[PDB]
Amino acid sequence: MKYDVVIIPESFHRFDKHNMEHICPPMVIGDRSYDIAMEIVNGVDRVIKASFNASVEELEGEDCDVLYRKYTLEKEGKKGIVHVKLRKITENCPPVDGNRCSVLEFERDIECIVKAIEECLAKGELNSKLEGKPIPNPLLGLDSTRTG
């Protein structure tokens, strides 16, 4: 048993007149055991809440997905939603196809997460696949935790 993380970063765009459809394809990495998964997620969580103006929300995933960590991102002039859901990669849940995050070490993994968010957020108002979940989050605030 391992856990396979699918991170879906998307700048939420309610389809406006013409140019407001921003979708970034999901990134899938499945090699982490639960213990290592929680460490990587916790670290990433702290980085997102400190390196960004992110308000996090925790949900439970659908069966195969054991955990669903929702992050509402705000960075300098950019806002998006990042949904990280963890699937239990098993013989019932095989490794899914998606974009592959450049995994190396913790620092590289987080930089890989940062580049994903920064790419999605910095591309902004464009036209893309017709999706986009504008999930309203009443909480607007980050969580102080500097790396030391």
Q: How many CA atoms lie within 13 A of 106 on its CB side?
A: 13
Helix (H, G, I), strand (E, B) or coil at 88: strand
Burial of 118 from C-beta contacts in 10 A (0-12 / 13-18 / 19+): middle
Measured over the CA atoms of residue 85, residue 88, residue 89 and residue 94, the dihedral's sign is: negative
Domains, the chain, with CATH or none: 1-148 (3.40.50.11630)
User: What are the beta bridge partners of residue 59?
Assistant: 68
Residues 6 or more apart in contact with residue 143 via CB below 8 angstroms: 46, 49, 50, 54, 56
Cα 148 to Cα 130: distance, rounded to the nearest angstrom: 42
Write b or e for each residue in 44-75: b if 16 or more Cβ atoms lie within 10 A of its Cβ, otherwise e.
bbbbbbebbbbbbeeeebeeebbbbbbbbbbb
Please provide residue 122's backbone torsions phi and psi, each rounded to the nearest 5 degrees.
-85, -15
Cα 21 to Cα 103: distance, rounded to the nearest angstrom: 29
Measured over the CA atoms of residue 10, residue 15, residue 17 and residue 18, the dihedral's sign is: positive
Residues 6 or more apart in contact with residue 115 via CB below 8 angstroms: none
* Beta carbons of 128 and 25 less than 8 angstroms apart: no
Which amino acid belongs to residue 132? G
Which residue spans within 60-143 are E strands per DSSP? Answer: 65-75, 78-89
Residues 6 or more apart in contact with residue 130 via CB below 8 angstroms: 15, 21
